[PDB]
Amino acid sequence: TVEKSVVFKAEGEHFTDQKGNTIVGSGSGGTTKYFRIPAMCTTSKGTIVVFADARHNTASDQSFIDTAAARSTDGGKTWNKKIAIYNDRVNSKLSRVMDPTCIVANIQGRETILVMVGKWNNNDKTWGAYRDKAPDTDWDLVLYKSTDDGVTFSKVETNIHDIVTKNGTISAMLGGVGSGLQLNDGKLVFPVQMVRTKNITTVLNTSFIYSTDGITWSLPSGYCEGFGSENNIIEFNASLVNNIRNSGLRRSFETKDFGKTWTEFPPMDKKVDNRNHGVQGSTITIPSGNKLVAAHSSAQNKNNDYTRSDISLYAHNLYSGEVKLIDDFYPKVGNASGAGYSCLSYRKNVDKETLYVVYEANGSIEFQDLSRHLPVIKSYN
Numbered sequence: 059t060v061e062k063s064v065v066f067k068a069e070g071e072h073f074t075d076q077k078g079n080t081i082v083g084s085g086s087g088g089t090t091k092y093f094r095i096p097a098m099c100t101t102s103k104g105t106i107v108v109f110a111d112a113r114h115n116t117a118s119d120q121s122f123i124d125t126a127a128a129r130s131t132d133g134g135k136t137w138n139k140k141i142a143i144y145n146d147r148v149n150s151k152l153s154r155v156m157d158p159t160c161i162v163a164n165i166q167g168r169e170t171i172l173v174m175v176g177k178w179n180n181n182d183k184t185w186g187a188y189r190d191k192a193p194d195t196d197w198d199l200v201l202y203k204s205t206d207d208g209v210t211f212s213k214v215e216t217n218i219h220d221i222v223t224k225n226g227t228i229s230a231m232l233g234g235v236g237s238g239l240q241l242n243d244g245k246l247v248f249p250v251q252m253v254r255t256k257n258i259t260t261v262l263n264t265s266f267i268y269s270t271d272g273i274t275w276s277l278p279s280g281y282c283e284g285f286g287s288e289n290n291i292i293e294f295n296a297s298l299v300n301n302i303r304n305s306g307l308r309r310s311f312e313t314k315d316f317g318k319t320w321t322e323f324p325p326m327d328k329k330v331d332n333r334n335h336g337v338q339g340s341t342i343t344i345p346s347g348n349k350l351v352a353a354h355s356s357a358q359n360k361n362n363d364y365t366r367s368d369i370s371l372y373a374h375n376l377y378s379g380e381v382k383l384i385d386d387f388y389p390k391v392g393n394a395s396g397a398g399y400s401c402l403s404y405r406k407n408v409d410k411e412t413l414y415v416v417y418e419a420n421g422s423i424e425f426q427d428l429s430r431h432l433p434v435i436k437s438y439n
């Protein structure tokens with residue numbers, strides 16, 4: 059409802075641990091230093107829930123991180139904040155939970171918010187460097203859920219570690235970043251990225267995990283090419299279509315056999331250029347009559363580097379393959395320490411449609427209401 063607000067302020071937030079003691083970060087006055095990787099979900103009550111890495115000491119990936127959650131019930135004007143998932147606190151310099159992917163769904167009639175993050179404790183190198191073990195012993199992928207509209211989160215005892223181990227060719231797995239989805243048949247789907255074991259020629263692959271109850275998960279038999287691995291999936295008729303990060307042009311593939319084989323999807327394949335290094339992007343579908351339109355956000359990256367400037371909203375015509383820039387909502391050069399990520403959230407509650415975005419803005423996480431752009435996006439079919 060509000061047009062724009064700051065969800066998490068770099069060097070402006072103070073969080074407390076499980077015992078009620080304040081977490082003294084490296085920010086001014088002992089605040090959390092930097093926020094990254096925003097994920098957002100809107101509920102049937104109109105509640106906006108935002109998750110993000112609370113990188114307490116540094117913006118670097120291998121650092122002390124907790125998953126923060128902010129909840130707004132007044133259209134994004136004010137935010138109630140807290141830590142949703144705490145890292146294990148084994149290593150004060152490296153313990154972390156990171157890269158959230160959320161899903162808002164109705165599981166057997168109960169509206170649930172699921173959040174999945176990767177967890178590490180002693181690894182001091184980038185996750186893609188660990189390929190000797192199946193899986194890496196330092197790694198874990200945890201899932202938390204909220205059944206009270208984002209107020210409290212609880213760990214879900216899942217079989218995810220089991221399926222990865224059983225596969226035997228996966229060193230580590232992570233969510234695609236941003237948001238997953240609930241299919242028409244009710245199944246929950248989390249797009250995933252995976253680092254394969256050393257013997258596999260392809261270092262990274264993309265796929266997804268699915269579940270009916272959110273407790274028992276499955277992995278399909280096939281694998282999609284990895285590229286920059288971060289990705290989102292959308293349901294289009296009887297297909298699952300992904301949108302993957304890649305240095306240069308984004309890639310898009312579709313499965314018509316539920317994860318067994320993937321072929322490039324022309325309407326979205328190589329349509330948006332993120333330039334050097336690539337960036338994570340959010341891709342969701344928006345209904346228009348009895349048709350669908352895909353809305354997407356990622357950085358134009360005008361400096362062709364890690365600054366990832368100009369985080370923009372695009373509309374993808376799934377039928378014709380046309381693409382159009384709808385709005386450059388953050389037309390600024392980002393902080394090379396960590397920038398460019400975003401997450402879109404569309405929802406139609408009763409007769410009210412809303413389109414929101416959450417994105418990285420120089421260490422902080424900002425929110426913008428993009429609903430005014432819906433008529434233009436919805437006409438792209």
Ligand SMILES: CC(=O)N[C@H]1[C@H]([C@H](O)[C@H](O)CO)O[C@H](P(=O)(O)O)C[C@@H]1O
Pocket residue numbers: 095119156157176184185186232286396397
């Ligand atoms: C688990 C993890 O490391 N996530 C980080 C990834 C990852 O290192 C790369 O995607 C290579 O796998 O990098 C991005 P970015 O630096 O491109 O902004 C920040 C993420 O927090």
Ligand SMILES: [K+]
Pocket residue numbers: 119184
């Ligand atoms: K990185």
